[PDB]
Amino acid sequence: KTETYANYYYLNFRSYTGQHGDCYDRFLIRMNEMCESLNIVNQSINKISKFNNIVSINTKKNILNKENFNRQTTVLPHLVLSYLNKNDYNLKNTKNDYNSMEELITHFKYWSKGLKVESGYTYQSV
């Protein structure tokens, strides 16, 4: 809880621990880690997936669009960010350094001197 970094704090994954600490135990740990990583990757992909669509009230046939990426692909990689951070999403999708002078200054500073970092010592583990 005090060390979870990005996305494991809310997703369910299975971790296997050996009862011998041998080479076979390490190999089994690696294999089980690969399998559980496949499962966790599937779960994470589903978390950003639109599993449901608007179904017609008349009968029960799903109202599938004809000119939509949602109709083409069920996965919407921008749905969560667009719904939760619409201001930042629009700001990023609209303004660019070729169009905004402030964005041009940001591109120049990031490519010449870099963003300034406050003084301090930190230690981050992944």
Binding site: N96, D97, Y98, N99, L104
Partner: protein, 92 residues
């Protein structure tokens, strides 16, 4: 035609010796891009302010720059500060 390093030439080409044959730049800059861009003609623009990006869309060329086509002298063209294209006034 006028000899380089003259006072008139310095006043004209912003205190620089312009190269007509463009081979001097093609050797100094290792590219004939100077003459290649010089092959372009002069464009007449109706508006006194133009928006030049060197291309067709934002980030598809250079950053947009506003050039003032209305100066003290009529018919004086201005080359883009971002691209090699030059634009001039439609009439004066």
């Amino acid at each position: 035609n006028l000899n380089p390093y003259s006072y008139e030439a310095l006043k004209e080409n912003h205190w620089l010796v312009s190269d007509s044959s463009k081979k001097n730049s093609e050797w100094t800059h290792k590219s004939n891009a100077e003459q290649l861009i010089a092959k372009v003609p002069i464009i007449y623009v109706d508006s006194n302010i133009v928006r030049c990006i060197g291309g067709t869309e934002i980030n598809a060329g250079h950053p947009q720059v506003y050039i003032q086509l209305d100066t003290r002298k009529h018919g004086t063209p201005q080359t883009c500060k971002y691209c090699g294209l030059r634009y001039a006034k439609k009439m004066d």
